[PDB]
Amino acid sequence: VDTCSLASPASVCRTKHLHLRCSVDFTRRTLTGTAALTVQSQEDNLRSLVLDTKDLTIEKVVINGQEVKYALGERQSYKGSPMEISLPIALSKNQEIVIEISFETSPKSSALQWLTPEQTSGKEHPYLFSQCQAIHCRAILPCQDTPSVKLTYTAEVSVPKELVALMSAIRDGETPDPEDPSRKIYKFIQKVPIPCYLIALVVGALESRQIGPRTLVWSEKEQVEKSAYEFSETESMLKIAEDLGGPYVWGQYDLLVLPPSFPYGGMENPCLTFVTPTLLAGDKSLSNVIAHEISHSWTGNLVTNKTWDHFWLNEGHTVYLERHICGRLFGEKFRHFNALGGWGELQNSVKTFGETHPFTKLVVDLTDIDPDVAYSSVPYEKGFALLFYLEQLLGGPEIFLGFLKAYVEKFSYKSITTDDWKDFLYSYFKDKVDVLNQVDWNAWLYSPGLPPIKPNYDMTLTNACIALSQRWITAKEDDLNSFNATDLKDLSSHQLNEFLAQTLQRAPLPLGHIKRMQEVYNFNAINNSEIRFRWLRLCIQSKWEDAIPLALKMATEQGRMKFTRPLFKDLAAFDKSHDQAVRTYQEHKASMHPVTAMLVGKDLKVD
């Protein structure tokens, strides 16, 4: 039972295919067109079915060439409004029909951000991008909006001719629009069945550059060069992910670098991963994000969580592969460094929510909860820690990766639950069930708070970071003089980041300490987004008025929620910046991503 969806569940009917024909209208900020669902009944004598929608205007519904009856129920908040459709003829089990719905979206569709020319790089053309995960697909097109259903799709998309459309699919060519020569139609085919949350569209002044045998980077012209360099390790990451997961089945692996308001670091849209431009650090240092989205091509897009209650299946196994890619690429010690940091992000989230909070459970009950409100690192790092703990328990990485590969083959193209996963783990490791029965399943899967067991981590790359952070925290005023630029001589940008996270955990420090840190380390100059983010947090929580404009500027000039949310929150909790924080949010809110706008609004207690 998918408690985030109002649609008929997969036991009743399932969508096998979507043919989308639509037109992007920048003047009205609407998508208008038809969604033709090929629907297979799962039941005898089926006479109606129910679809998810959200802020969609339905024009008509056509089956066997006739307008048919349908009704929209009362809006149920962030779930949207169910659409009941009356079939003209009862369907037997396994029978397929095609249902063609004429629809138009709202400019406030929570799946979409419409950008004015001034909000892009070029300054002449507008831009549109989608984000359907978790349950915003219903705000683009009526559908069974649940990952328990997988479908193929094909689409034809008409856009102003000087713009380009891309989707989560293989590009199938372009032509002038026969109905209007001011337009081009772009075609797309996704031959591999997918959950609808992986449906994606961008329309913009896009250009592409080739960076490996199956990868082109796409962005606006002014980001292309820099992105081709930043993401140059992409092919080699695919080669390793294929070795760990089995064949890459999706044809293409492209990258789209979005405008700065993209709400995520990355989004594993099939054939076309979307990434934040805040990845462009100039040194490839943030590439683990690519490794992570690549990994979804197996864990997530092939084997999918059946409902969002089981999200950790998606994310934990994906972080687990991500960290294996990075460990192959850079050495086992680096995998362990990133693993430990991830445990540290886990400590932060549990501390923030509170150790008994329901959202700190690995498996969560999302009835009545908006998945955007519940979203945190918990399913990522608690899930990763589980797998990392089982890895050590069952004989090491090589052995656990043999399980990961077999799990992918086993559930390829399916949607699965935590029990489906646990069963296969027991089956695969039958010769080691004795060890498996020593796991505290009830605590690991269903209890709030930190996991009951913390794995073993190599400390090698981490020590220098913990040591500098401890010098800073235990320093008194008469110790500040001994800090020098050379303290950082031997730290990678990742160690500098981990140095800041250690220190941010004990924040505030005295203002004097922070000022000296700027004096000797000149963190203000660093443009790596992760480092700068943590440094501005350390500054604002330690109450340094000079950082108020730097924090306001970062919070609004990009919209990656990981950064923009805690920055606004910190700013709001600092009395000197509180008023400018709420003022700034209120000035920017209209032209913000609607999901970010909503979440920043709640974090600020505004509206």
Ligand X SMILES: CC(C)C[C@H](NC(=O)[C@@H](O)[C@H](N)Cc1ccccc1)C(=O)O
Ligand Y SMILES: Clc1ccc2[nH]ccc2c1
- Closer residue to ligand X (CB): 301 or 584: 301
- How many residues in total does the chain contain? 607
- Closer residue to Zn ion (CB): 274 or 585: 274
Minimum distance of ligand X from residue 562's CB (angstroms): 5
Strands 70-72, 83-91: pairing kind: antiparallel
Residue 167 annotated as binding site: no
Q: Which residues pair with 345 in a beta bridge?
A: none
Residue 268 annotated as binding site: yes
Q: Which residues bind ligand X (CB under 6 A)?
A: 133-134, 264-268, 288-289, 292-293, 296, 375, 380, 562
Contact between 595 and ligand Y by CB under 6 A: the answer reads: no
d(CA 312, CA 387): 11
Q: Indicate which single residue of 266, 342, 379, 566 sits in contact with ligand Y (rule: CB under 6 A).
A: 379
Residue 131 annotated as binding site: yes
Contact 529, 496 (CB under 8 A): no
Minimum distance of ligand X from residue 197's CB (angstroms): 8
**Active-site annotation holder among 156, 220, 230, 293:** 293
Q: Can you tell me whether residue 211 is helix, strand or coil?
A: strand
Residue 459 annotated as binding site: no
Task: Taking each helix axis as running N to C, give the angle between helix 397-411 and helix 383-393, from 0 to 180 degrees, rounded to the nearest 10.
Answer: 120
428 binds, among Zn ion, Yb ion, ligand X, none (CB under 5 to 8 A by kind): none
Q: Can you tell me whether residue 408 is helix, strand or coil?
A: helix
- Closer residue to ligand X (CB): 380 or 535: 380
- Closer residue to Zn ion (CB): 318 or 495: 318
d(CA 254, CA 147): 23
Contact between 364 and ligand Y by CB under 6 A: the answer reads: yes
- Closer residue to ligand X (CB): 288 or 497: 288
Other C-beta atoms lying within 10 Å of the C-beta of residue 541: 18
Other C-beta atoms lying within 10 Å of the C-beta of residue 536: 27
Going by C-alpha positions, the residue among 274, 279, 104, 291 that lies closest to residue 201 is 274
Minimum distance of Zn ion from residue 176's CB (angstroms): 38
DSSP per-residue codes, 445-492: HH--SS-SSPPP---TTTHHHHHHHHHHHH--GGGGGG--GGGGTT--
Where in 126-185 is the site for ligand Y (CB under 6 A)? Answer: 134
- Closer residue to Zn ion (CB): 288 or 318: 318
- Closer residue to Zn ion (CB): 129 or 274: 274
Both ends of the chain: CA-CA distance in Å?
A: 34
Using alpha carbons only, give the angle 180, 121, 297 rounded to the nearest 5 degrees: 80
Tokens read off for 82: 């169910």
Between 318 and 337, how does the x/- string for binding to Zn ion read (CB under 5 A)?
x-------------------
- Closer residue to ligand Y (CB): 312 or 585: 312
**Active-site annotation holder among 186, 320, 380, 521:** 380
Q: Please tell me the count of residues contacting ligand Y according to CB under 6 A.
A: 11
Contact 97, 39 (CB under 8 A): yes
Residue 132 annotated as binding site: yes
Minimum distance of ligand Y from residue 401's CB (angstroms): 25
Between 425 and 464, how does the x/- string for binding to Yb ion read (CB under 5 A)?
-x--------------------------------------
Contact 129, 201 (CB under 8 A): yes
Contact 342, 250 (CB under 8 A): no
d(CA 403, CA 409): 10
Minimum distance of ligand Y from residue 199's CB (angstroms): 17
Q: Is 380 a catalytic residue?
A: yes
Between 280 and 319, how does the x/- string for binding to ligand Y read (CB under 6 A)?
----------------------------x--xx-------
Other C-beta atoms lying within 10 Å of the C-beta of residue 182: 10
d(CA 362, CA 386): 10
d(CA 12, CA 48): 10
Minimum distance of ligand Y from residue 594's CB (angstroms): 17
Contact between 375 and ligand Y by CB under 6 A: the answer reads: yes
Residues with Cβ within 8 Å of residue 427, at least 6 apart in sequence: none
Minimum distance of ligand Y from residue 374's CB (angstroms): 4
Query: What radius of gyration do the chain's Cα atoms show?
Result: 25
Q: Indicate which single residue of 124, 180, 423, 519 sits in contact with Yb ion (rule: CB under 5 A).
A: 423
Contact between 378 and ligand Y by CB under 6 A: the answer reads: yes
Task: Taking each helix axis as running N to C, give the angle between helix 332-353 and helix 311-330, from 0 to 180 degrees, rounded to the nearest 10.
Answer: 150
Contact between 478 and Yb ion by CB under 5 A: the answer reads: yes
Active-site residue numbers?
293, 380
Residues lying near Zn ion in the complex (CB under 5 A) are found at 315, 318
Question: Binding site for a peptide: which residues?
Answer: 131-133, 263-268, 560-562
Positions in the binding site for ligand Y (CB under 6 A): 134, 308, 311-312, 359, 364, 371, 374-375, 378-379
Return residues touching Yb ion (CB under 5 A): 172, 423, 426, 476, 478
Known binding positions = 131-133, 263-268, 292, 296, 315, 560-562
